[PDB]
Structure 1
Amino acid sequence: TRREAIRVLGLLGALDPYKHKVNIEMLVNMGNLPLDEFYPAVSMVALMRIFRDQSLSHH
């Protein structure tokens, strides 16, 4: 299978990287605030990610 996946990249040619480009905050948080404010803000941001999706159901 890996052999075919290469043989097919061969036949399709080698695309120029530019031609493929056409075809296709946490540090910032700390960059601004003092540490006593930063700690709530970073805690909340990390909690909000868990809040969305079905991961919240487990926790």
Structure 2
Amino acid sequence: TRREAIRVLGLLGALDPYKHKVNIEMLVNMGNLPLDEFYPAVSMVALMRIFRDQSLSHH
């Protein structure tokens, strides 16, 4: 299947990368806020990241 994938890729032609292109914050937090305010900010961002989705059902 690796061979067939490579073969079909060659058959379809080596697409120009530009043609492929046309076919297709925490650091900022530190840069803006001082450390004392930054610590709760990053903490809350990560906690919300866990808070959404089904990982919350575990944590």
Question: Structure 1 length normalisation: TM-score?
Answer: 0.98
Q: Provide the C-alpha distance between the structure 2 equivalents of 1:3 and 1:19, rounded to a whole number of angstroms.
A: 25
Question: Unaligned regions of 5+ residues in structure 1, if any?
Answer: none
Between the two proteins, the alignment pairs up a number of residues equal to 59
Identity of aligned residues (%): 100
Report deviation, 1:45.
Answer: 0.2
Unmatched runs of 5 consecutive residues or more in structure 2: none
Q: Secondary structure at the match of 2:57?
A: helix
Task: Tell me the TM-score normalized by structure 2.
Answer: 0.98
- Residue 2 (str. 1) matches residue 5 (str. 2): no
Runs of 4 or more above 6 Å deviation: none
Rounded to whole Å, the distance in 2 between the matches of 1:33 and 1:53 is: 28
